[PDB]
Amino acid sequence: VDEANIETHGMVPMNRLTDDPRWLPAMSERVTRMVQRDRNHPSVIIWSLGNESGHGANHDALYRWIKSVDPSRPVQYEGGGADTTATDIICPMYARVDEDQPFPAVPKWSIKKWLSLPGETRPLILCEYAHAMGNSLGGFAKYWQAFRQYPRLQGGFVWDWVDQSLIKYDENGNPWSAYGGDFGDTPNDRQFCMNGLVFADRTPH
Amino acid sequence: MSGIFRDVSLLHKPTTQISDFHVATRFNDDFSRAVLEAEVQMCGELRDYLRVTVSLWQGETQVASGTAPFGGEIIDERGGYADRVTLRLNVENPKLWSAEIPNLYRAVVELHTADGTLIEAEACDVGFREVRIENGLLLLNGKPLLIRGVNRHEHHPLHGQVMDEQTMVQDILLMKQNNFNAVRCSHYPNHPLWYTLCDRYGLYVVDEANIETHGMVPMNRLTDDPRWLPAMSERVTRMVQRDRNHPSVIIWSLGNESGHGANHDALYRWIKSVDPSRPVQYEGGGADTTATDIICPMYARVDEDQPFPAVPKWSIKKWLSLPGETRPLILCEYAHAMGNSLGGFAKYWQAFRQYPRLQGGFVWDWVDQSLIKYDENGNPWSAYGGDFGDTPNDRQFCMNGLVFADRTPH
User: Fold this and answer.
1) Most-buried pick from B60, B191, B297, B379 (CB within 10 A)?
2) CA–CA separation, B286 vs B325, rounded Å?
């Protein structure tokens, strides 16, 4: 699944960069440029405009462009709660099968519930599930049990394949993995960055 | 039980009298103003002079009055109806009937002479409610409906099939007392009195056509056959005319456990066309049948689904989720009450609150079915199954009761 190189986690509201009319030309290049280069490959089955960029007018405009230039591949966008008009298939991220937690303006429901919502027909694939950080994947069976159970649920991508760490050298020169801003870059989110199913080197968690 | 289980009465009608009258309600999105129009059909001789007047009375004070000359609307194409008059009454800020509140209006249809004396008078209880299915969610009066209902079989151990007027009131109080706002009668039209009680008292009523064909194999055969349609038609067609007027009924059900037949599809179409007011639901065919507006899986399990070839059953959460399905789902039955029952009852209700689409389902069944028997001593002992020796007897399974017949609460 190809992803347009747009993220705007930082901005508050997050949608502001994507939402603004002026920013559209900068936004366009990443979606537009990406399609031409990667359109040819047989393997790609999907186009994703943005990740965690929120919902903006540009995404709706951009989503329309991808369909018109290319009708071959379904387009999915996570942002806006994943219930956004732009995404062909719902991609709730970190959604819980058993239970749903809602944040005002960004409600999250159990995947079984989410398909069931009034006036919803779209197939649902999770952007992420079963976070692999540290000890992880607990209740992993439950997610998969649900996927087999429901025809509509297409399953979701696990996060994340490789823990992110950078080699560091001791005075001895032995190499120790570094998590977060070991280098002192600040503020450092530290440990959360690795998020890894398998060791970098790589070894299997 | 075969016999006359219902009252026999004699009725006298003037030579010119209105054979049938219809009451219909229209509401603004605000619901502030509702337009009510009633159509009356007059039997036999027609007089130009004679006029029909409709008066709407709420409490002791009338809200609106309607008067019309006979015949209306110039229906296409040959002629306007000679004997039909349509009267429209406009009500603003009308109280709306609801399970919590009856909010009843009283409507009187009077056919009178021009001067004029009135040949006959008809009175029908009117409740202003709008029931529609919007966006796959059943909606009453603009509000999504959560239905808690218990299937009711009209049975009395002492008097058997015939129901004392008191029993309905006693039964009605318990269901309303017990947090039950909705009652479904399976699977035959309830006593004529019974509908009237609901309208005053509170709870929603779902009418059911008196067709069942559990026995036939395949079960659908009786319903399915073209020849049987005329016999089938009478139960659905006859039922609608008699029970259409009552404010309380929110639904029409063509059949129970009759399977899926061509007739049901034809019958379902007829009910919609004759009456567009009420959603139609049919259990048979797996409940996924085209005829039913709202899915009514019976004995469906929330957590897990068991499938029988050609009749797949899925957990209710799964069933809404099925590809190309938009209909609101209400269970015909759940939480069987027989013996010890209702285990995992919490789970079903937990699901209903969780999902907007699920409207909840009627519990089965309100009254255990038992017949009094007398010992040599003459003490009365409840009888389950073919105690009398009728055979083969299904025995115990028949009672299926939430509350004791007498009645006491399980």
Assistant:
1) B297
2) 14
Measured CA to CA, the distance from residue A116 to residue A146 in angstroms comes to: 14
Whether residue B323 and residue A151 make contact (CB cut-off 8 A), yes or no, is: yes
> Which one of B45, B134, B333, B376 is the catalytic residue?
B333
- Distance of alpha carbon B319 from alpha carbon B317, whole angstroms: 6
Question: Any chain A CB within 8 A of the CB of B31?
Answer: no
Which has the closest alpha carbon to B128: B106, B150, B151, B153?
A: B106
Which of B83, B75, B13 minimizes the C-alpha distance to B52? Answer: B83
Q: Which residue carries 């067709």 as its tokens?
A: B211
Residue A118 has its nearest CB partner, among B135, B322, B354, at: B135
Instruction: Give the H or E element holding residue B20.
Output: strand B18-27
CA torsion through residues B322, B327, B332, B335, sign: positive
How do B149-152 and B182-185 pair as beta strands? parallel
Q: Which residue has the tokens 């004029």?
A: B116
Expt. technique: cryo-EM
Which of A112, A117, A151 has the CB atom closest to B317's CB atom?
A: A112
Cα gap A16→A27, rounded to integer Å = 12
3-state secondary structure of A119: coil
- Give A195's contacts (C-beta < 8 A, 6+ positions apart): A131, A132, A133, A159, A160, A163, A164
Nearest Cα to Cα of residue A84 among A45, A39, A54, A115: A54
CB contact (8 A) between residue B137 and residue A118: yes
Nearest to A41 by CA among A87, A2, A89, A88: A2
Concerning whether B257 is annotated as a catalytic residue, the answer is yes
10 Å Cβ neighbour count for B225?
A: 15
Which of the residues A97, A114, A116, A150 would you substitute to probe the B interface, choosing the one with the greatest number of B C-beta atoms within 10 Å?
A: A116
Helix (H, G, I), strand (E, B) or coil at B202: coil
Take residue A25 and report the two structure tokens written for it. Answer: 């030309």
Domains of chain A: 1-205 (3.20.20.80)
Single-letter amino acid code for the residue at B144: P
Q: Is A96 on the interface with B (CB under 8 A)?
A: no
In Å, what resolution does this model reach? Answer: 3.2
B136, HSE (Cβ side, Cα atoms, 13 Å): 18
The helix (H) or strand (E) run that includes residue B167 is: helix B165-177
Structural tokens at position A26: 């900068």
